[PDB]
Amino acid sequence: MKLNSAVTASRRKCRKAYFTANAETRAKMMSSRLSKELRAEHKIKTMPIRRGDIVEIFTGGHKGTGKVVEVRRRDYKICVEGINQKARNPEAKPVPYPIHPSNCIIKELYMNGSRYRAIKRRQERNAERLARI
Amino acid sequence: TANKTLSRKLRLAKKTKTNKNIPRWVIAKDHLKKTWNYKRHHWRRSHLKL
Amino acid sequence: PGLKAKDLVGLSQEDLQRKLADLKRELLSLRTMKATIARFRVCKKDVARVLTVINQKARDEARAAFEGAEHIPKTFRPRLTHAMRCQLTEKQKRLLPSKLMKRKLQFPKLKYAVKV
Amino acid sequence: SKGTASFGKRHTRIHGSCRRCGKHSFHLQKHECASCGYPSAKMRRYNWSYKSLRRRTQGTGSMSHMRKVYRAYNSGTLKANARKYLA
Amino acid sequence: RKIRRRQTRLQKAKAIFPCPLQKLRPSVTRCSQKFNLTQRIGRGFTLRELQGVGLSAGKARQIGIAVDPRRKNKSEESVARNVARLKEYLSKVTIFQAIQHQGVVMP
RNA sequence: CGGCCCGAGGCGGCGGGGGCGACGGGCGGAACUUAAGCAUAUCAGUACGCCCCGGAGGAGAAACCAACCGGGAUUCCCCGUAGCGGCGAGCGACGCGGGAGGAGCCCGCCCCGAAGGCGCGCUGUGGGCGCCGCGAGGGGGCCCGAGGGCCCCGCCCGAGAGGGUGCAAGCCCCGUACGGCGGGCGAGUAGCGCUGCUUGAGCGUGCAGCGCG
RNA sequence: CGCCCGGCCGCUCAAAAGACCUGAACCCGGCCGGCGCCGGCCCGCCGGCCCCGUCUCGAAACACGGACCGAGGAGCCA
RNA sequence: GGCCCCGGGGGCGAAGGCGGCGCGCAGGCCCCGCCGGACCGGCCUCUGGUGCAGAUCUCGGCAGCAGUAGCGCUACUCCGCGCCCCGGAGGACUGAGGGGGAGACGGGUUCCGCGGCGCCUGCAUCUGGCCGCGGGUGACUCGGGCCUAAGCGGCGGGUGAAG
RNA sequence: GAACGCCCCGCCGGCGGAUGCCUCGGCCCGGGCGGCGACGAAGAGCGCGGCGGAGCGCGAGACGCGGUGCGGACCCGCCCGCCCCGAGAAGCACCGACCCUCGAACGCAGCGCGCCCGGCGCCGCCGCCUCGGCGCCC
Numbered sequence A: 001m002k003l004n005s006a007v008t009a010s011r012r013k014c015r016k017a018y019f020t021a022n023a024e025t026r027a028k029m030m031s032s033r034l035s036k037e038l039r040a041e042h043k044i045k046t047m048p049i050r051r052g053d054i055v056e057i058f059t060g061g062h063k064g065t066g067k068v069v070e071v072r073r074r075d076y077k078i079c080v081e082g083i084n085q086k087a088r089n090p091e092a093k094p095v096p097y098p099i100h101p102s103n104c105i106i107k108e109l110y111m112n113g114s115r116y117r118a119i120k121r122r123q124e125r126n127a128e129r130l131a132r133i
Numbered sequence B: 001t002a003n004k005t006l007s008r009k010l011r012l013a014k015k016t017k018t019n020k021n022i023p024r025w026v027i028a029k030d031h032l033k034k035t036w037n038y039k040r041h042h043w044r045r046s047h048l049k050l
Numbered sequence C: 001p002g003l004k005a006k007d008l009v010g011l012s013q014e015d016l017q018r019k020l021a022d023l024k025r026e027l028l029s030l031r032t033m034k035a036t037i038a039r040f041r042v043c044k045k046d047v048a049r050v051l052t053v054i055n056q057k058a059r060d061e062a063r064a065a066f067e068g069a070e071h072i073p074k075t076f077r078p079r080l081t082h083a084m085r086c087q088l089t090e091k092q093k094r095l096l097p098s099k100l101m102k103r104k105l106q107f108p109k110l111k112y113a114v115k116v
Numbered sequence D: 001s002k003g004t005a006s007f008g009k010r011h012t013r014i015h016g017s018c019r020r021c022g023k024h025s026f027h028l029q030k031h032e033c034a035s036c037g038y039p040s041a042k043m044r045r046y047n048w049s050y051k052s053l054r055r056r057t058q059g060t061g062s063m064s065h066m067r068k069v070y071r072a073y074n075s076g077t078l079k080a081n082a083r084k085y086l087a
Numbered sequence E: 001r002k003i004r005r006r007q008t009r010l011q012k013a014k015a016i017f018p019c020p021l022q023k024l025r026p027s028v029t030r031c032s033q034k035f036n037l038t039q040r041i042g043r044g045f046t047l048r049e050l051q052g053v054g055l056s057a058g059k060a061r062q063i064g065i066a067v068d069p070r071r072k073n074k075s076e077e078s079v080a081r082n083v084a085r086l087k088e089y090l091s092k093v094t095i096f097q098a099i100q101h102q103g104v105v106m107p
Numbered sequence F: 001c002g003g004c005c006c007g008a009g010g011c012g013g014c015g016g017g018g019g020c021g022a023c024g025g026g027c028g029g030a031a032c033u034u035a036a037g038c039a040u041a042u043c044a045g046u047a048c049g050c051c052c053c054g055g056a057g058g059a060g061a062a063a064c065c066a067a068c069c070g071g072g073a074u075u076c077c078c079c080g081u082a083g084c085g086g087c088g089a090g091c092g093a094c095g096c097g098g099g100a101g102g103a104g105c106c107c108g109c110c111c112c113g114a115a116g117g118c119g120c121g122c123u124g125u126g127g128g129c130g131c132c133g134c135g136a137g138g139g140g141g142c143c144c145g146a147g148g149g150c151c152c153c154g155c156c157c158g159a160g161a162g163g164g165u166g167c168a169a170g171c172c173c174c175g176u177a178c179g180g181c182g183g184g185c186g187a188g189u190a191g192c193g194c195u196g197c198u199u200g201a202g203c204g205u206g207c208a209g210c211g212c213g
Numbered sequence G: 001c002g003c004c005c006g007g008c009c010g011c012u013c014a015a016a017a018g019a020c021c022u023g024a025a026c027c028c029g030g031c032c033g034g035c036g037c038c039g040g041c042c043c044g045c046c047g048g049c050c051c052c053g054u055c056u057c058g059a060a061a062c063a064c065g066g067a068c069c070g071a072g073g074a075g076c077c078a
Numbered sequence H: 001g002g003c004c005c006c007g008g009g010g011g012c013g014a015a016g017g018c019g020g021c022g023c024g025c026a027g028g029c030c031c032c033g034c035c036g037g038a039c040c041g042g043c044c045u046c047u048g049g050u051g052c053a054g055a056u057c058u059c060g061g062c063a064g065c066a067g068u069a070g071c072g073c074u075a076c077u078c079c080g081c082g083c084c085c086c087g088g089a090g091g092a093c094u095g096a097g098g099g100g101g102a103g104a105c106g107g108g109u110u111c112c113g114c115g116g117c118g119c120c121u122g123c124a125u126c127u128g129g130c131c132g133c134g135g136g137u138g139a140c141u142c143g144g145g146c147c148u149a150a151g152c153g154g155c156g157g158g159u160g161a162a163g
Numbered sequence I: 001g002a003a004c005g006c007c008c009c010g011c012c013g014g015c016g017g018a019u020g021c022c023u024c025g026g027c028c029c030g031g032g033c034g035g036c037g038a039c040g041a042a043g044a045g046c047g048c049g050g051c052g053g054a055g056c057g058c059g060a061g062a063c064g065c066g067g068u069g070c071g072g073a074c075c076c077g078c079c080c081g082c083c084c085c086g087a088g089a090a091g092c093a094c095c096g097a098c099c100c101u102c103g104a105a106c107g108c109a110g111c112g113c114g115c116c117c118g119g120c121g122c123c124g125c126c127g128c129c130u131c132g133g134c135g136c137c138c
């Protein structure tokens, strides 16, 4: 049961917030679980999906694994390499079947200066909570 | 009239310039199905009071 | 791309007036090519970066030319609403007559506790 | 001939564009606006037509200055700026 | 509205801790033939009542007594009942972990 | 020729003007309607028109109420008939009593005379809540376009408010519970006479014009 | 994809859901069967049957309203 | 608001739609087949903007009538692949108060060139004041700006509860 | 007789948009807040995007410019551009500027003109400069 009275529990307002969200909120809402192997190494549970990661898909009719070529933030979907619409011609181009990030599990992460730091920032706060508890 | 003030000429000039269709790339960009601009007008059936 | 606003800070007035002359003339060349393409976007906002700086150096100079004057130009006066400019000061609102005051120093404020 | 024939005698402009409200309501012979009341210093407003009041009022335009002042008050630094001044 | 008023008098009580929220008010006779023989809370104490115990109007206002110089006593019993009320309150008052008194003082 | 008195033109600093479908203050002010007709009455001291503020406004420290073994500035809440009226239809306050809140003061006159805010003033100055962030825990088997479905075994719970996800999800994802930052006392007056409006106020409730004072 | 010169065939898809969810009534076109309500009989014969709502002493009335069909549509509250 | 005995019915097919049996004096209820493709209830207690044939009812759709009633200004024809468009030849009309050539007012891009026929051009169209894409109005001497007409404003102030 | 019309013994098509389910919207109550303007408001006009009509936004610095923080891969089409332990796309908050014509609307007019070489509206308060009077006096 909720206790905070500045937070809506109204379906109409909650649905309006899923749409019409700004771009920084939409990125966070497109997260996925890290694999067990990365959970031990990084000590984090989920991560926001990104162009350049490798994902293992389940629960769908397009199961498989591949790299993230595109992010359709308006749709909350991601295009993976190798997961296409079944095509008509033998020659014609591939057409990506778009996957929802929560149907995925990340197997390897794209790394740069900002992604190392935001992980380390998130571990130190999760250790504040583990000291309070 | 052939004898008009510059102030009436300028407001008439703006109704002429904005009397246009939606560009086709705008229809692809914004993903539209209504394609007619219903703020258009035609000289035979209009009553621009300007 | 194009000019950074930071790298015109430190330039003299002549080196900024002279730099604005080329930008204006270049947009004439590029508007002439358009009517007779990526660069023309960046040039419009290079012009705005410079004029931003010419005005920001001129305001900091003048706002010291008047730092200690009694009457200040109205652009350099504090940012307040029309109603705030017309209100009495807190000191002006707390002023009391002489007899009224000399009775408030007699009989000060006291903390006390009552019992059941 | 008070009907269709009489309508063919119309080649005049009674009203023109108002300089204050922009509408086709400025009487060219009396030099007054039948919508906003110009050249009167105050605006023409009547309580017997609240629909006419909502068509042109505060909020139906940009509110460009008033928007900035309110956001500065509600969440900016303006309430601090009064304390420094009103001291 | 019930919650708003309770919140306002909680904030006011901290700002004056440990002073109570109420002044000491006198005991007066309810006024008509229908209601005499019973008492209620009045507005303030008279200067004849204050002369009894040894306080000036400015002096008694300082330690929490309400003073009403417009009221005049109608009898000798009105004075004795309220002087005894003034005398008692001065006993149970301390002037500077302290107790704030709730509700009306000496109902 | 200077002074004081009464005016004129210019210059400097500062202030005013307009805006709002509410609440608030001041004026002007209907008719429909009811009376089974209709003039007084009612609707209504309303609609609407004009002016003026504020974050509230207005009101306010008794030329008060009372008739008591008495109260004691203003406002707001609960409570209930005196009376007015083609005495018809209709209209209509208030004190006492119970509560919310509570706070008290000044000038004129009189004394001193420039002691003052000093180009002025002796025709009198001055004194007496919002910003940050962490955030637990589910598999295997059938089946479907797709499992949030069915079968069988578990875990988390200060979190089973809820939204999303290809079909009913605590454990697929965002959140939800558990916390940190900033923090000596007033005159064309009072009153009275005549007249108009207004009130429950009735040989006058309140206001006003003129004559008197 | 193909074939004829818009159509056919068929492709995507769980499905055309194809300019779009479902898709009722009134009304209509093609193929197939037959020649108003009540009652008896298996079935086209015999028997009975004026147009409802309304005001009204009295309506089938030459008294008024009503082509048809759908959805909305009138004693609640203080 | 509750219950629905290991916790009510549902993609192994909910609500709705179309036909067909049964049950009830009746209002109505229940089942089956086909369609449809995501939600729905039986019993107890509570609540209401709670049931249509009519109001010259309201809004929407739409039949017969019915391939019906109907389509001033003298006039076109031959050939060019030929359309009422274009060309050539013929025959006529408007009849200088013009179906001619130009301005004022009003309209506002209708002007021009190239393309085109989905809409319009109550028949047709290859036409076009229709649709798409490009273009277009140059002043010392012409007009407006100036002057005053009939008028209309302003004026230390005056008046009115104000406007 | 056939056909037309009518009924439905059934199987398919049209026309129309009811019913069912769905909802970034309304309505009601409560809590906050009470923050405009000659430093030019509210409102109106015109203009501004690489390909740009409407609406939002902005003002010739125009579909935005700068500064401090935060954030960390995108930017609906076609292009551009960004990409990295900082090199920096989307997004967010505060702060500093720019801010065309009309409007209380301010040189006169409303689109045309002046006086003067800074500029040039009305009312009021306080000061100051220069002055008038057969007012009272000298």
Ligand SMILES: [K+]
Pocket: B001, B002, B003
């Ligand atoms: K012309």
Ligand SMILES: [K+]
Pocket: B043, B044, B045, B046, B047, H107
């Ligand atoms: K026209």
Ligand SMILES: [K+]
Pocket: D001, D002, D003, D004, D005, D006
């Ligand atoms: K006629």
Ligand SMILES: [K+]
Pocket: D026, D027, D030, D032, D033, D034
């Ligand atoms: K007028």
Ligand SMILES: [K+]
Pocket: F029
């Ligand atoms: K009245």
Ligand SMILES: [K+]
Pocket: F031, F043
């Ligand atoms: K009336």
Ligand SMILES: [K+]
Pocket: none
């Ligand atoms: K009457």
Ligand SMILES: [K+]
Pocket: none
């Ligand atoms: K009457």
Ligand SMILES: [K+]
Pocket: F040, F041, F085
């Ligand atoms: K009466």
Ligand SMILES: [K+]
Pocket: F041
């Ligand atoms: K009356």
Ligand SMILES: [K+]
Pocket: F035, F088, F089
């Ligand atoms: K009567």
Ligand SMILES: [K+]
Pocket: E022
């Ligand atoms: K109290």
Ligand SMILES: [K+]
Pocket: A102, A103, F165, F172
């Ligand atoms: K999922």
Ligand SMILES: [K+]
Pocket: F187, F188
């Ligand atoms: K007198």
Ligand SMILES: [K+]
Pocket: none
């Ligand atoms: K009098």
Ligand SMILES: [K+]
Pocket: F199
């Ligand atoms: K009365």
